Write a protein that binds this ligand. Structure first.
Ligand SMILES: *[C@@H]1O[C@H](CO)[C@@H](O[C@@H]2O[C@H](CO)[C@@H](O[C@@H]3O[C@H](CO[C@H]4O[C@H](CO)[C@@H](O)[C@H](O)[C@@H]4O)[C@@H](O)[C@H](O)[C@@H]3O)[C@H](O)[C@H]2NC(C)=O)[C@H](O)[C@H]1NC(C)=O
Ligand SMILES: CN(c1nc(-c2ccc(F)cc2)cs1)c1c(CCNC(=O)c2ccc3[nH]c(=O)oc3c2)nc2ccc(C3CCN(S(C)(=O)=O)CC3)nn12
Ligand SMILES: [Ca+2]
Ligand SMILES: [Zn+2]
Ligand SMILES: [Zn+2]
Length: 780
């Protein structure tokens, strides 16, 4: 019943046996002598000239003896003080082309150094405040920042780091949660969070174990000091090959904790940060003693950022809801609302655009921006509040706290850090910002593990690594397009559409692709049947199942001209002579549908001539749109496409419908579609997307780009009102573009939602294209 020889053992035991592992305290299950033998502090964590060559005294926190290296329990500065060696930080960056490991090491180990609440902008503090972290960043591979998941809270983000999955898929949807199946709640404080039932997916430590790669315990009882956590990792690395883990995690509650008290603005954040840097230097000094500093891959990574949030900036739901004791609220930098043991429609309405200075917005979770991927889990309440940065929402009525996090993950203040350092990482390399969902695959790559299915795009971060085992390959196209000729007469069509001889070579099976499909046809990766339709100004992939385009592709040059829709073509809808009446929409559906109207994917505002404009009124270019949404879409088409073309030296636009009625972020099947236009087989999209591509080199036009591409995309909610936009009663120039920015999207998001694969034909490497597809334009 003792921890003698068992401190931070990788075994777990009992009862009636008592434990000595990293989490024995959190279960109050340690042996009588744990704190004595395992949580030692005597003589601190640094050697002194005095202690060099001491006979081992087991009561010291760490040792300065000749045997200390054999056990890996030296003070981290032992060789510096007692062998005339240099601190790691004081050594010059030297490139590590190959892993340089002690005898018996079969792979380079991975150490994940996770820091809680470490905002990206903290890195600017410099080698003055943080020399060790600055060396890792400079010598190794780093990003300017790493995007967390939503909500930007510890437990969702740390588990996303571990699994490569969105909170909705791994299950840890918040620091606080209620699961209606368990009829139980998850809390930061308590033992409940230790129950495995909450934790889905497959975290790295499990992935590694299943594939015969031993893992260190990632979790550390809060009582264990950081120096001890580092020393434990170093002792573990000192173990024989058949006991030694290949993957380790250190975790620090800082600088988060100080961020809460001080805020990210505090000049007093420097001390916390300097502590962290010290811990890093201890780790690197430690590795250097053990001859592991050119062997181990080190990842320095945060879980989220920190914002200035004071208790005076608090919205109270009681000031909006007159029935506030009928609801439970997960409060703070977000809101999640639920009935206590109640009508969500009147709740939302009562929370919508009530006050000028309203610092939150209510959403049914399916209406939240799709980039957040925050809906598909029974643990996520139907009603959600997006709270403005710097604010809080509480249920009912100086501060102790001055900082917090949890906000929308595109907010600057929420951004966090990534540094990769070691033989497998690149030397002195800066990489673009990326999302934390991508890291799991990398960590698997760094350990030679086959990753479990996750939300990362494997390959999109190959550019971080000197050597990558994984080679991404484009998916095979499943459905082939038809390329139909003019194979129907006008008189054959009876659609119910009003619209006021010519030599017919019109549906130009030529020139179009070259000027309107710049990056290849989208591959359809599901089994369906569709037709490629050509026109002077646009090309489309028309679905015969959904009776509208899956994608509409067109290029608008810098100097493109914008025209209006004439009075005589306002209600013009024309039949296509390449597609049968049966596989066409009809106007009667819309004239019968009191709520639903129609718009066009290719805009009639950007036709290249009066003649070409008639093709924009084809029934095959038509899609169901609520009047409310047409305000948005029309403004996009008439004003904003032109503006983007003007700013970016031409744009290629790929627009289309999205069906996600079950809000799983994935292309609906026909069966999952829950709304059609009245009395028709024509489905109503939940969203409309556009992918706006151009040359990164803006001195080259979009259609004549010889190099990297620039992308911006959105997934607009197809809503019957504009209640989401509080200034929607004003001119569209005052609110539409802001709505679109809120609903910015990765191409990869659109791919999940459509089952299309974009950018198949380019001059760029496929891994670069994966990077392009993972890009998110944030407007922050
Ligand atoms: C983010 O990545 C997630 C993981 O790849 C994606 O979730 C997966 O989504 C698919 C399709 O909806 C599901 O596939 C079905 O799986 C069932 C049962 O097998 C799996 O069951 C559990 C579910 O928790 C899973 O964890 C196990 O690994 C099992 O393999 C099959 O019977 C069906 O035929 C079908 O294949 C996956 O279950 C699901 N996995 C997880 C872990 O969520 C998610 O779609 C991605 N999100 C986006 C937006 O792309
Ligand atoms: C989730 N988590 C931890 N994750 C890692 C980790 C993950 C991936 C990496 F690449 C590196 C490291 C290490 S520890 C975790 C924690 C962290 C504790 N924080 C807080 O309590 C906290 C900190 C700051 C906050 N600010 C704020 O507003 O709220 C804050 C909260 N604690 C625990 C406890 C238990 C677990 C479980 C994970 C799942 N396993 S399982 C079933 O897979 O074996 C069980 C343990 N987990 N955890
Ligand atoms: Ca779906
Ligand atoms: Zn955190
Ligand atoms: Zn915090």
């Amino acid at each position: 019943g003792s921890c003698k020889g068992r401190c931070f053992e990788l075994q777990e035991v009992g009862p009636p046996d008592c434990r000595c592992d990293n989490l024995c305290k959190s279960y109050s299950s340690c042996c009588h002598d744990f704190d004595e033998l395992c949580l030692k502090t005597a003589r601190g964590w640094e050697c002194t000239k005095d202690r060099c060559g001491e006979v081992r005294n087991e009561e010291n926190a760490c040792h300065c003896s000749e045997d200390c290296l054999s056990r890996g329990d030296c003070c981290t500065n032992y060789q510096v003080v007692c062998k005339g060696e240099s601190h790691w930080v004081d050594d010059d960056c030297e490139e590590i082309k190959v892993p340089e490991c002690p005898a018996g090491f079969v792979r380079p180990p991975l150490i994940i150094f996770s820091v809680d609440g470490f905002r990206a902008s903290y890195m600017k503090k410099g080698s003055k405040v943080m020399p060790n972290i600055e060396k890792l960043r400079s010598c190794g591979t780093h990003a300017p920042y790493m995007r967390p998941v939503y909500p930007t809270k510890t437990f969702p983000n740390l588990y996303t780091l571990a699994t490569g999955l969105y909170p909705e898929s791994h299950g840890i949807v918040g620091n606080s949660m209620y699961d209606p199946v368990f009829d139980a709640s998850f809390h930061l404080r308590g033992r409940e969070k230790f129950n495995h039932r909450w934790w889905g997916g497959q975290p790295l430590w499990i992935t590694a174990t299943k594939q015969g790669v031993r893992a260190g315990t990632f979790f550390w009882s809060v009582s264990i000091p950081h120096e001890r956590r580092i020393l434990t990792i170093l002792q573990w690395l000192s173990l024989p090959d058949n006991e030694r883990p290949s993957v380790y995690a250190f975790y620090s509650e800082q600088p988060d904790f100080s961020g809460h008290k001080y805020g990210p603005f505090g000049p007093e954040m420097t001390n916390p940060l300097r502590e962290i840097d010290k811990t890093v230097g201890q780790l690197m000094d430690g590795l250097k003693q053990l001859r592991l500093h050119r062997c181990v891959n080190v990842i320095f990574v945060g879980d989220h950022g920190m914002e200035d949030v004071t208790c005076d900036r608090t919205e109270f739901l009681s000031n909006y809801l007159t029935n506030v004791d009928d609801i439970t609220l997960v409060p703070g930098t977000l809101g999640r609302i639920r009935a206590k043991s109640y009508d969500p429609k009147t709740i939302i309405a009562a929370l919508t655009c009530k006050k000028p200075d309203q610092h939150f917005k209510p959403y049914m979770k399916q209406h939240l921006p799709k980039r957040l991927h925050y809906a598909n889990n029974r643990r996520i309440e139907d009603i959600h509040l997006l709270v403005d940065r710097r604010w809080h929402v509480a249920r009912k009525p100086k501060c102790f706290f001055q900082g917090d996090h949890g906000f929308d993950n595109k907010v600057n203040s929420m951004q966090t850090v990534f540094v990769g350092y070691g033989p497998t990482f690149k030397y002195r390399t800066k990489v673009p910002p990326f999302e934390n969902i991508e890291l799991y695959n990398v960590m698997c790559d760094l350990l030679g593990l086959k990753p479990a299915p996750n939300n990362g795009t494997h390959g999109s971060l190959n550019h971080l690594l000197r050597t990558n085992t994984f080679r991404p390959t484009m998916p095979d196209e499943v459905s082939r397009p038809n390329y139909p000729g003019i194979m129907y007469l006008q008189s054959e069509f009876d659609l119910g559409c009003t619209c006021d001889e010519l030599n017919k070579r019109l549906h130009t099976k030529g020139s179009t692709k070259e000027r309107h499909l710049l990056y290849g046809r989208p591959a359809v990766l599901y089994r369906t049947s569709y037709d490629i339709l050509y026109h002077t100004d646009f090309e489309s992939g028309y679905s015969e199942i959904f009776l509208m385009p899956l994608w509409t592709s067109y290029t608008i040059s810098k100097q493109a001209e914008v025209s209006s829709i004439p009075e005589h073509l306002t209600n013009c809808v024309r039949p296509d002579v390449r597609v049968s009446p049966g596989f066409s929409q009809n106007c009667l559906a819309y004239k019968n549908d009191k709520q639903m109207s129609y718009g066009f994917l290719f805009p009639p505002y950007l036709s290249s001539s009066p003649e070409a404009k008639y093709d924009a009124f084809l029934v095959t270019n038509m899609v169901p749109m609520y009047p409310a949404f047409k305000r948005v879409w029309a403004y996009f088409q008439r004003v904003l496409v032109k503006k983007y073309a003007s700013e970016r030296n031409g744009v290629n636009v790929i627009s289309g419908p999205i069906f996600d009625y079950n809000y799983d972020g994935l292309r609906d099947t026909e069966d999952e579609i829950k709304q059609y236009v009245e009395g028709s087989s024509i489905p109503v999209p939940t969203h409309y997307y556009s992918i706006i591509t151009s040359c990164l080199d803006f001195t080259q036009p979009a259609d004549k780009c010889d190099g990297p591409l620039s992308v911006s995309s959105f997934i607009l909610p197809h809503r019957p009102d504009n209640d989401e936009s509080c200034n929607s009663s004003e001119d569209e120039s005052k609110w539409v573009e802001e709505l679109m920015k809120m609903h910015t999207a990765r191409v990869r998001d659109i791919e999940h939602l459509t089952g299309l694969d974009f950018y198949r034909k380019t001059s760029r490497s496929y891994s670069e294209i994966l990077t392009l597809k993972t890009y998110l334009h944030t407007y922050e």
